[PDB]
Ligand SMILES: NC(=O)c1c(NC(=O)Cn2cc(CO)c(C(F)(F)F)n2)sc2c1CCCC2
Ligand SMILES: N[C@@H](CCC(=O)O)C(=O)O
Ligand SMILES: N[C@@H](CCC(=O)O)C(=O)O
Ligand SMILES: [Li+]
């Protein structure tokens with residue numbers, strides 16, 4: 283039928299989507315800012331749709347419960363028909379690809395290590411061979427699943443430690459992991475995507491650092507319910523935006539034009 | 546109907562597909578080796594098909610003629626029904642995505658600069674601001690199209706020079722560009738994908754180098770004719786291989802276990 287206003291699910295994750303400081307003064311899409319707010323506007327312009335930004339109710343990316351088989355997060359909003367499209371730093375994974383459609387990637391990333399400056403850790407192997415510095419991941423996301431599923435010795439060692447560590451090493455939001463790095467005096471390291479790590483490294487108080495090579499190599503895609511008619515035009519818009527350099531412009535806008543820690 | 550032997554189109558490009566030194570002694574798929582030969586075997590195993598490797602007749606990646614609208618290269622073999630799948634370092638681009646299907650990417654890359662060691666060039670901006678050192682790209686590929694289409698000032702300057710330079714700066718194969726870098730005493734620089742650049746930098750005679758940041762950020766996908774029933778299983782196999790670390794293993798096998806230029 284006729285075109286309808288598209289419900290966009292997204293997540294508060296800096297610098298992809300952030301509440302504007304003065305958001306209580308504002309209405310609708312204007313409340314938010316960030317890389318994915320700008321991306322949404324570009325994809326909607328190129329595909330010719332009107333849209334409403336909504337923040338995922340449960341604050342999660344999307345995982346399936348092993349007992350109930352119910353999807354949560356942004357993936358769940360798509361699967362159950364609550365949103366029409368997810369425009370967020372949503373990692374392309376096998377499990378997710380089987381239940382939703384993804385565009386080609388709009389940004390690349392890998393899992394990485396964040397430390398408080400001066401922590402004596404340079405690698406995942408170093409984490410795995412000691413115990414004084416605790417380490418963990420986000421819940422309900424792809425980084426947790428990476429460790430849980432890994433058959434690679436160093437990552438399996440790390441998961442075996444993380445799943446049983448007390449107190450819990452897992453966090454509900456990225457911001458919580460960063461806060462824990464910052465407040466734990468070098469005794470917590472956080473495993474998170476390179477894109478988020480690199481953003482935070484250039485924010486005040488400039489007390490974190492990315493160390494080591496990335497652990498994997500993957501990407502974020504725009505997600506639609508399986509078989510949706512938005513899938514094909516959204517995919518072509520991501521490739522056009524990539525080829526026009528708009529994705530690179532946006533990355534510079536929100537990472538390194540935002541840098542507060544000098545050159 | 547019943548499963549049939551799958552015709553794979555690919556291209557001789559090191560270290561993705563190479564003739565084994567003793568290939569005249571060998572038959573069929575056994576003649577070839579490389580990252581994409583190993584990838585083909587893995588994708589065929591995971592998808593349950595038998596296959597035949599074939600080298601693209603015309604030795605091209607795939608471009609459309611602006612007059613005739615005919616596709617050449619591996620893209621053409623897919624479009625015209627001569628091959629069932631392309632398993633090669635085939636860049637995901639808008640123009641191509643409109644006519645064939647691509648898996649999610651199996652490797653990431655960007656356009657990059659190769660120099661003979663000691664050449665006084667550190668960047669694309671440096672190339673663009675001088676004339677003593679000639680520079681060019683491969684024909685019938687995505688790097689040429691990147692420059693031809695760019696509205697970015699430095700890249701448009703470079704294309705304006707390249708399209709009219711005499712003698713021609715363009716090459717028919719990667720190997721030809723490398724040979725030209727090596728033989729031109731620092732007076733030719735070659736624009737090529739980072740993956741190929743980094744491979745060649747670790748091969749004897751160890752006289753080339755990658756300089757500068759990548760110019761773009763993209764990926765290679767496995768390609769199938771539009772609407773083919775191999776598309777979905779091939780895409781899931783690429784994601785499973787990525788998540789199992791097989792893609793990373795293969796990259797180390799063919800890049801850095803193959804390195805001849807020391808540590
Ligand atoms: N900008 C990108 O990240 C990008 C790419 N990024 C990647 O290829 C990174 N990446 C690697 C993998 C393998 O795991 C993935 C995947 F598979 F997760 F999709 N993304 S491919 C590509 C683009 C832009 C549009 C053209 C094609
Ligand atoms: N991008 C991740 C969330 C962050 C993480 O797991 O580190 C996902 O899509 O699940
Ligand atoms: N990967 C390229 C060929 C190499 C290049 O253009 O530098 C293509 O798919 O056209
Ligand atoms: Li999917």
Ligand SMILES: [Li+]
Pocket residue numbers: 641642643644645646647
């Ligand atoms: Li396509």
